Amino acid sequence: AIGGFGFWFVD
Amino acid sequence: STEYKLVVVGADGVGKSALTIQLIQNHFVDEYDPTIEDSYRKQVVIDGETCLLDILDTAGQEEYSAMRDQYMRTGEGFLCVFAINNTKSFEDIHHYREQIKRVKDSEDVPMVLVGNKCDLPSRTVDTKQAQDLARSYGIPFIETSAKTRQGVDDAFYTLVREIRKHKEKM
Ligand SMILES: Nc1nc2c(ncn2[C@@H]2O[C@H](COP(=O)(O)OP(=O)(O)O)[C@@H](O)[C@H]2O)c(=O)[nH]1
Ligand SMILES: [Mg+2]
C-alpha cells in the first residue's frame, strides 16, 4: 500500500 | 550493447502506448487497447553507444500488477508522462514520482517529465508550470507529440542520459 495514487495496489 | 530498463508511467490516455510504439516501431497508433501493459526490447544508438532499451508500457491504474511491481523496483529510468490538454494527468505526476521514490527507497531516481500531445491547439497545461515542476525535481522536461513523432527520440534518449549520469555518480 505504497502511495500516493499513482498506481493502486503497489505494495 | 548497454542495457537500460525504462518504465513509462502516467494517467490513462496521456499517450504512453503511442509514445512507446513510436520509439520502437516508428508508427503512430490512433487507437490502442488502454488496458494492456507490455514490455519492449529494442536496440538503439545514443551518443555513440549501442544501447538495448527494455521499456515497460504500463496500464491498469486501478489494478494490481506483478510486472509493474518488478519494473518499478528494478527500473533505472521513469518517463513521467502527462498530456498538455489534461491538467489532471499533470496533477498525477507528483503521485507517480513519489510512489516511485518510495518503492525505490531513494531520492536519486532518474526521471524525465514529458508533456505529450504538443501537436494540439487546445492546451491547458502552460509550459511554465511544467518547467517549474521539472526544475523543482531537478529533472529534464521535454514536450512531445507521438502523432508527429516530435521530440519522441529526445524524450527517451534524455532518460538514458539521466541514467548514465546517475550510474557514474554511484
Ligand atoms: N493528438 C495526439 N493524440 C495522441 C498523441 N499520443 C497519443 N494520442 C492518442 O491519445 C489516445 C491515448 O493514447 P495511448 O497511447 O493509448 O495512451 P495511454 O493510455 O497513456 O497508453 C489514443 O487515441 C492516441 O492515439 C499525441 O501526441 N497527439
Ligand atoms: Mg496504453
**How far, in Å, from the CA of B16 to the mean position of ligand 2?**
6
Strands B141-143 and B49-57: unpaired
Does the CB atom of residue B116 touch ligand 1 within 6 A? Answer: yes
Residue B33: exposure state from Cβ atoms within 10 A (0-12, 13-18, ≥19): exposed
Report which DSSP code applies to B110: -
Give the Å distances, CA to CA, from B126 to B16, B122, B142, B149.
20, 11, 13, 21
Documented resolution in Å:
1.9
Domain ranges of chain B: 2-169
A1 touches chain B (CB under 8 A): no
Residue B144: exposure state from Cβ atoms within 10 A (0-12, 13-18, ≥19): buried
Cα separation of B77 and B109, whole Å?
7
Q: Which of A2, A8, A9 sits opposite B102 (nearest CB)?
A: A2
Q: Do B94 and A8 touch (CB under 8 A)?
A: no
Query: Cell numbers of B165, please?
Result: 549520469
Query: Cell numbers of B12, please?
Result: 490513462
Pick from B125, B46, B135, B48: nearest CA to B92? B125
Structural contact between residues B55 and B24, judged by C-beta atoms closer than 8 angstroms: yes
**How far, in Å, from the CA of B48 to the mean position of ligand 2?**
30
**From which experimental method does this structure derive?**
X-ray
Torsion of Cα atoms, B147 then B150 then B155 then B160, to 10°: 110
Q: Do A7 and B102 touch (CB under 8 A)?
A: no
Q: Under CATH, what is the fold of the domain B2-169? A: Rossmann fold (3.40.50)
Computed from CA positions of residues B112, B161, B151, B141, in that sequence, does the dihedral angle turn out positive or negative? positive
